[PDB]
Structure 1
Amino acid sequence: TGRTTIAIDPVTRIEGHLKAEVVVENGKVVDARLSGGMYRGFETILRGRDPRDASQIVQRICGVCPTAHSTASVLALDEAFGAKVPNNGRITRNLIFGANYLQSHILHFYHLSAQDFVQGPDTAPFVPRFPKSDLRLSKELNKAGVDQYIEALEVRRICHEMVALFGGRMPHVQGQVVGGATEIPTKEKLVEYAARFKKVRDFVEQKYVPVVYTIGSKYKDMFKVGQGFKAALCVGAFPLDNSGKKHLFMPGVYAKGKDMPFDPSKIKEYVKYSWFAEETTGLNYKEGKTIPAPDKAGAYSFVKAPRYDGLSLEVGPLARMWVNNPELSPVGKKLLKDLFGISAKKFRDLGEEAAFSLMGRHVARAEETYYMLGAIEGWLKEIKAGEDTVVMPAVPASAEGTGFTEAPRGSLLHYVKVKDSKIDNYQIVSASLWNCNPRDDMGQRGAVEEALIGIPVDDIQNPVNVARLIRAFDPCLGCAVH
């Protein structure tokens, strides 16, 4: 067959506003363009404010991942203000934020992704859908998916109770500020966090990790597509001591089969194909500028095009788990052997091709959820009830700072420059920015654009694998554009 061009707007069962347009020739995607179609402009809204306001304002970039922006913002403010976060506040922040990794990954697999593989009940919003949706599960396994979708609604809600115990509320925590965390954990509230955590742990271990491998074993073809550039970024997250040099996820870049250090000075944001003024192209975030140009010819997105030393990279659980190469979960090791014939001990034992794949990204996210359980368990042992969690630093007249962390969807940094005690510039380089961006000034595609190349579309009237690939990356276009 010849060419068919397919536009999907809105791409659903992601967060935010995304259009995907693919060129299909002879049953495969041969080109792609992603468009982030909604803009707010937080980077200009923030200017002129008391810098401490940023750690509230920025959370409204995303209602799914507000703890990530809270964390990057307070880390940037900590650095700019010279705030020395007490040890117990560092741990409390990790407990607040870590609980939302659990929420977000569970939300993503069940409430966004699972309908790619599972037929829901015969009522809205589960119908109507594509007449040939390629839903391969037996009646029993499909019912397990539905039952777990329903259970996961409660589990993700419990995760937000965990966030709120020391975070105040969720979405949009009150409990992280420059200088630490606003509420010292009490013995009683730590009991409450742990009791909820046990329920989440049981669901992750007994239901979620097994179902991803089991569903994957019915869609083995989905480990053979979606590789893209096979290039990844991690900037580090969840500090494990007060030195700034040791983290649960350590930083690194992976591209063209090679591990390399992460140097943030090599980040540049291009705009040729983005709706921003041409004279702002190619800036590192420390000199970043956000000047919308919604009528600019040739552009197709409000997402800028970030490149690392010229490279187009992806971010997220696959990226972090590939860079850090932890041991796989016990149940993953067992199901890889039983259902796939794969003997693996550490994450990279999946091999580059299967890891960097549509289904590999779902697997990585489930494995990362299991990995986060042990980190949270460690923090519950390390935290000291009653010990102060915050310092109260004065606002500086002139300063700069950068906060680096990993949102559930990937690498996140916030840069702030303060002048006359007010925000002079604030620049955000977020997770889905790295994944869902358009071409750069040289014409090199963004990570998801490139990962779409080769995706099978054997039925142009039911082109389900286009959005299936996109969903594996867990897009959040509010974050991508801000």
Structure 2
Amino acid sequence: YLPITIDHIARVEGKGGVEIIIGDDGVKEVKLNIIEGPRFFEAITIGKKLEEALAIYPRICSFCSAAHKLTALEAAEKAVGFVPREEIQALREVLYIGDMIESHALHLYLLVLPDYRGYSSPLKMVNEYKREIEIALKLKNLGTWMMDILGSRAIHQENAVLGGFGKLPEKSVLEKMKAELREALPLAEYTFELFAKLEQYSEVEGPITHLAVKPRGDAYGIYGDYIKASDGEEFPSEKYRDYIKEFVVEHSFAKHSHYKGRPFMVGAISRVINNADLLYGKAKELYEANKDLLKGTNPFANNLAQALEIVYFIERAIDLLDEALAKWPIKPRDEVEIKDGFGVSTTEAPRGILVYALKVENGRVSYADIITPTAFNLAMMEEHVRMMAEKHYNDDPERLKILAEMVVRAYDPCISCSVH
């Protein structure tokens, strides 16, 4: 009856808010109200032909068009029984890594750092911290450029198609890339050492359940057929319903999710906690020297795990462009018989796990189930804000309203994703 309402959260993707309920005991409930209109991407596409429903899923969210679209892809292709050609996956992993490289570098640098430096806007430390932001746009624009080469674009990639790609580039470009990647690994190196010196607050330390796709071969990756949880459990990616369940609350247009009847966290610390040993390159050594910072016990270690992965994914697409280039010349796409069937895929989107589940019958989409990572995260997010609200509630409100948000901004919430 005297709430703390943060009508909008700055420097996150989407339209949302907070209603932290203060009592007489301290903190009752924390409510992240999420107001971003459903766009019913799960229903308006129903009865629509596959291809046509597929060029539309990326418009759920511009921070992760590749992810959605390259995930839509894998699940329409288990459905119609296709299998990718080998160098054609390596390219899809590459394109996913410039969605990844850029997302983090845009969340970290233009959404997270402003709070630990004093600035409301990133458009502000422009002539005060020039080198960082020049480091910022260099990582981001190897991101932005990679997507503009293998996907026509960064926001909603129309070249990645059923079967592969509509025009793969000249060889020299996958070489120049690998040349621009190698001229990037020192830039993410800087970003590791910057976000590790930063504060992972004490009011949030506490036990968390961490879930992640498991890499379908020898290395830390994105694609894979087995969701792992931090207890030491594993369950088939095809039974995500039979192991995690949804529920509507009146205080959001986004569902909420439980593993084992309780909150869990996906989104990069989750991947390091679960699949840390599958790493190599400068990133293995950076985890094996900075691990009292990469524990599953603090939200904000999401931010430094991002920095680590820009080390990994930079180096791995170096190898992955190399693998592709050993099958050159490559036919762009192969023909896909659209036969009926069902398919689930689970991939590591920039923020945790994205599930696409597609049913097609007679060329058109009869069913679909999507759950995005910010939606998965909404519910431990609220608890970690409560935990901060506990140890700070009878503060000057504006001293409080800053620190809960940083927590929100530590998940990299992407609300156009949690509501589709």
Same fold, TM-score > 0.5, yes or no: yes
Q: Which one-letter code corresponds to 2:193 in the other structure?
A: P
User: In the TM superposition, what is the alpha-carbon distance from 1:184 to its structure 2 partner?
Assistant: 3.3
Q: In structure 2, what is the Cα distance between the partners aligned to 1:320 and 1:355?
A: 10
Q: In structure 1, what is the Cα distance between the partners aligned to 2:369 and 2:283?
A: 41
User: In the TM superposition, what is the alpha-carbon distance from 1:429 to its structure 2 partner?
Assistant: 0.9
Q: Which one-letter code corresponds to 2:262 in the other structure?
A: L
User: In the TM superposition, what is the alpha-carbon distance from 1:157 to its structure 2 partner?
Assistant: 2.4
SS state of the match for residue 404, structure 1?
A: strand
1:364 to 1:29, Cα distance in 2 relative to 1, 3 A:
farther
SS state of the match for residue 225, structure 1?
A: helix
How far does the alpha carbon of each residue in 1:126-146 deviate from its partner, in whole angstroms, 9 at most, with x for none? 59xxxxxxxxxxxxxx944x5
1:120 to 1:380, Cα distance in 2 relative to 1, 3 A:
same
User: In the TM superposition, what is the alpha-carbon distance from 1:271 to its structure 2 partner?
Assistant: 3.0
2:250 corresponds to 1:325: no
Structure 1: 4+ residue segments shifted above 6 A: 25-28, 331-334
Q: In structure 1, what is the Cα distance between the partners aligned to 2:410 and 2:369?
A: 27
User: In the TM superposition, what is the alpha-carbon distance from 1:323 to its structure 2 partner?
Assistant: 0.6
Aligned to 2:191: 208
Q: Tell me whether 183-192 or 100-109 shows the greater mean CA deviation.
A: 183-192
Q: Which one-letter code corresponds to 1:434 in the other structure?
A: F
User: In the TM superposition, what is the alpha-carbon distance from 1:272 to its structure 2 partner?
Assistant: 4.1
1:209 to 1:328, Cα distance in 2 relative to 1, 3 A:
farther
Aligned to 2:298: 357
Aligned to 2:166: 182
Aligned to 1:163: 147
2:253 corresponds to 1:311: no
1:81 to 1:166, Cα distance in 2 relative to 1, 3 A:
same
Aligned to 2:16: 18
Q: Unpaired runs of 5+ in structure 1?
A: 128-141, 274-298, 335-343, 437-445
SS state of the match for residue 52, structure 2?
A: helix
SS state of the match for residue 117, structure 1?
A: helix
Q: Tell me whether 420-429 or 469-478 shows the greater mean CA deviation.
A: 420-429
User: In the TM superposition, what is the alpha-carbon distance from 1:67 to its structure 2 partner?
Assistant: 0.6
Aligned to 1:108: 107
Aligned to 1:254: 229
User: In the TM superposition, what is the alpha-carbon distance from 1:368 to its structure 2 partner?
Assistant: 1.9
1:187 to 1:328, Cα distance in 2 relative to 1, 3 A:
closer
Maintained 8 Å contact 1:185/1:386:
no
Q: Which one-letter code corresponds to 1:115 in the other structure?
A: P
Q: In structure 1, what is the Cα distance between the partners aligned to 2:117 and 2:26?
A: 24
1:266 to 1:113, Cα distance in 2 relative to 1, 3 A:
same
Of the candidates 363, 373, 381, which is equivalent to residue 431 of structure 1? 373
Q: In structure 1, what is the Cα distance between the partners aligned to 2:275 and 2:25?
A: 36
2:396 corresponds to 1:459: yes
Question: Percent of aligned pairs with the same residue?
Answer: 23
Equivalent residue runs for 1:30-109 within 5 Å? 31-38=29-36, 39-109=38-108
Q: In structure 1, what is the Cα distance between the partners aligned to 2:69 and 2:419?
A: 17
Of the candidates 386, 410, 416, which is equivalent to residue 329 of structure 2? 386
Q: In structure 2, what is the Cα distance between the partners aligned to 1:93 and 1:451?
A: 35
User: In the TM superposition, what is the alpha-carbon distance from 1:75 to its structure 2 partner?
Assistant: 0.3
User: In the TM superposition, what is the alpha-carbon distance from 1:81 to its structure 2 partner?
Assistant: 1.1
Maintained 8 Å contact 1:37/1:302:
yes
1:227 to 1:67, Cα distance in 2 relative to 1, 3 A:
farther
Q: Which one-letter code corresponds to 1:461 in the other structure?
A: E
Number of residues paired by the alignment? 405
Q: Which one-letter code corresponds to 2:161 in the other structure?
A: V
Of the candidates 350, 353, 360, which is equivalent to residue 418 of structure 1? 360
Q: In structure 1, what is the Cα distance between the partners aligned to 2:64 and 2:209?
A: 24
Q: Which one-letter code corresponds to 1:453 in the other structure?
A: R
1:236 to 1:70, Cα distance in 2 relative to 1, 3 A:
farther
Q: Which one-letter code corresponds to 1:69 in the other structure?
A: H
SS state of the match for residue 149, structure 1?
A: helix
**Aligned alpha-carbon RMSD (Å):** 2.9
User: In the TM superposition, what is the alpha-carbon distance from 1:195 to its structure 2 partner?
Assistant: 2.8
Maintained 8 Å contact 2:267/2:350:
yes
Aligned to 2:381: 448
Q: In structure 2, what is the Cα distance between the partners aligned to 1:86 and 1:42?
A: 29
User: In the TM superposition, what is the alpha-carbon distance from 1:333 to its structure 2 partner?
Assistant: 6.5
Q: In structure 1, what is the Cα distance between the partners aligned to 2:289 and 2:187?
A: 23
User: In the TM superposition, what is the alpha-carbon distance from 1:365 to its structure 2 partner?
Assistant: 1.5
User: In the TM superposition, what is the alpha-carbon distance from 1:363 to its structure 2 partner?
Assistant: 1.4
Q: In structure 1, what is the Cα distance between the partners aligned to 2:212 and 2:265?
A: 9
Equivalent residue runs for 1:261-276 within 5 Å? 261-263=234-236, 264-273=240-249
User: In the TM superposition, what is the alpha-carbon distance from 1:240 to its structure 2 partner?
Assistant: 5.0
1:30 to 1:116, Cα distance in 2 relative to 1, 3 A:
farther
Q: Which one-letter code corresponds to 1:100 in the other structure?
A: D
1:345 to 1:85, Cα distance in 2 relative to 1, 3 A:
same
1:87 to 1:253, Cα distance in 2 relative to 1, 3 A:
closer
User: In the TM superposition, what is the alpha-carbon distance from 1:346 to its structure 2 partner?
Assistant: 6.9
Aligned to 2:136: 152
Q: Which one-letter code corresponds to 1:317 in the other structure?
A: A
2:413 corresponds to 1:470: no
User: In the TM superposition, what is the alpha-carbon distance from 1:70 to its structure 2 partner?
Assistant: 0.9
Q: In structure 2, what is the Cα distance between the partners aligned to 1:312 and 1:328?
A: 31
Q: Which one-letter code corresponds to 1:210 in the other structure?
A: E
Q: In structure 1, what is the Cα distance between the partners aligned to 2:144 and 2:123?
A: 24
User: In the TM superposition, what is the alpha-carbon distance from 1:228 to its structure 2 partner?
Assistant: 5.8
Q: In structure 1, what is the Cα distance between the partners aligned to 2:145 and 2:292?
A: 35
Q: In structure 2, what is the Cα distance between the partners aligned to 1:192 and 1:402?
A: 35
TM (norm. structure 1) is: 0.76
Q: Tell me whether 415-424 or 17-26 shows the greater mean CA deviation.
A: 17-26
User: In the TM superposition, what is the alpha-carbon distance from 1:324 to its structure 2 partner?
Assistant: 0.6
Q: In structure 2, what is the Cα distance between the partners aligned to 1:253 and 1:236?
A: 6
Maintained 8 Å contact 2:283/2:312:
no
Maintained 8 Å contact 2:209/2:263:
yes
Q: In structure 1, what is the Cα distance between the partners aligned to 2:241 and 2:373?
A: 17
2:209 corresponds to 1:231: yes
Q: Unpaired runs of 5+ in structure 2?
A: none
Aligned to 1:406: 348
1:394 to 1:43, Cα distance in 2 relative to 1, 3 A:
same
SS state of the match for residue 314, structure 1?
A: coil
Q: In structure 2, what is the Cα distance between the partners aligned to 1:318 and 1:47?
A: 35
SS state of the match for residue 262, structure 1?
A: strand
